Amino acid sequence: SDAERDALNIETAIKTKGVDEVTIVNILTNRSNAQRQDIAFAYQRRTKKELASALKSALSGHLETVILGLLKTPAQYDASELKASMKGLGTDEDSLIEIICSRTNQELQEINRVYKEMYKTDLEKDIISDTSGDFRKLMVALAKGRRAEDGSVIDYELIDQDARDLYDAGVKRKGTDVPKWISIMTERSVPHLQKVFDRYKSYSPYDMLESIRKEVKGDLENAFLNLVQCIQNKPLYFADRLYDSMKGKGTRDKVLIRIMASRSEVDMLKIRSEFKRKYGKSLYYYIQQDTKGDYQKALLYLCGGDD
DNA sequence: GCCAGGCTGG
DNA sequence: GCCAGGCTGGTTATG
Ligand SMILES: [Ca+2]
Ligand SMILES: [Ca+2]
Ligand SMILES: [Ca+2]
Ligand SMILES: [Ca+2]
Ligand SMILES: [Ca+2]
Ligand SMILES: [Ca+2]
Ligand SMILES: [Ca+2]
Ligand SMILES: [Mg+2]
């Protein structure tokens, strides 16, 4: 890599009359996150100005959102998105749910650490302040990032007991024992819960997702639905969330940008494979139909190719 | 989950 | 009939 050559080409594009957005996109969306950190360092040393601030002046619109997000480290970006989801008197529960429900223990440990560094308060405290009831209990538990790690031994006895407990806490009874659902679904390892959800189908006339829809409502329902999909098949979860961000009128750009940026370097090949298999056309194609301009170009580079 | 009703398959 | 799935609504499950 040549961070200083990239940093120089970016400054030229910034200072150019009208701004050369294509140069900025072509560079930043075709570099790894670590290469971008080096570019930003090299840029500050050359210009005495922060790259992120210089681009926030030089860009606007959805393109600005993409590019500024790409400049943050993965944990910084996640922490900033969590902060933004909680900003003001409301809560963006959909975004909070997406991040907390899909991040691994190791990702969440770094988010907790980085959040506190950037905002001087614990993530858990902001979550407690923005949520209430069982939804709060579930989000706070997940955010600890202390799910059991995948053991070397499959515990079939516990798989069966957990399935019965989920059934007895929900569909089988009047009302719902939500704390039993929260315990099992936050504490057990991911491969364990995968097996629990199939075993659950032996006891229950409905699968886990349909049981959630029948038993709970609102933010709690949304959160359990996202979590179960994340446990069952996380690349498919992101493929479905991307399809949902585009399928209808307009675009849920906040969701589309965040997924494309945060997964580009993690599992985007699997996301693309699941998307193409389910929807028959490529993720690339859906992005092309829903977005335009340099913004489109940036997302297509994060996609990484057709099919 | 319970009690039913009609429906589509093999 | 039997086997496997679905969808409705009424009287509704440690209720
Ligand atoms: Ca321009
Ligand atoms: Ca701007
Ligand atoms: Ca708030
Ligand atoms: Ca809200
Ligand atoms: Ca119930
Ligand atoms: Ca519901
Ligand atoms: Ca659309
Ligand atoms: Mg790439």
Numbering used by the authors: 33 to 339
What does the paper say about this structure?
AnxA2 preferentially binds to phospholipids and other anionic polymers and does not contain any canonical RNA- or DNA-binding motifs. Importantly, AnxA2 was shown to bind phosphorothioate oligonucleotides and has been implicated in the release of PS ASOs from endo-lysosomal compartments in productive ASO cellular trafficking. In the present study, we co-crystallized the C-terminal domain (CTD) core of AnxA2 with a PS 2′-MOE DNA gapmer ASO and found that unique hydrophobic interactions between PS groups and lysine and arginine residues account for the enhanced affinity of PS ASO to the protein surface.
From our crystallization trials, we obtained two types of AnxA2–ASO co-crystals that were used to solve two structures referred to as structure I and structure II, determined at 1.9 and 2.4 Å resolution, respectively. The asymmetric unit of structure I contains one AnxA2 protomer and two chains of ASO. Unexpectedly, partial complementarity of the ASO region that encompasses nucleotides 2–10 promoted intermolecular base pairing. The key interaction is formed between loop IIIAB (the convex surface of AnxA2) and the phosphorothioate between nucleotides dT14 and dG15 close to the 3′ end of the DNA. The interaction is primarily mediated by contacts between the backbone and aliphatic parts of both amino acid side chains that make van der Waals contacts with the PS group. Distinct electron density from the calculated difference map was clearly visible around the phosphorus atom and Rp non-bridging atom in the inspected PS linkage, which unambiguously confirmed that only this PS stereoisomer is bound at this site.
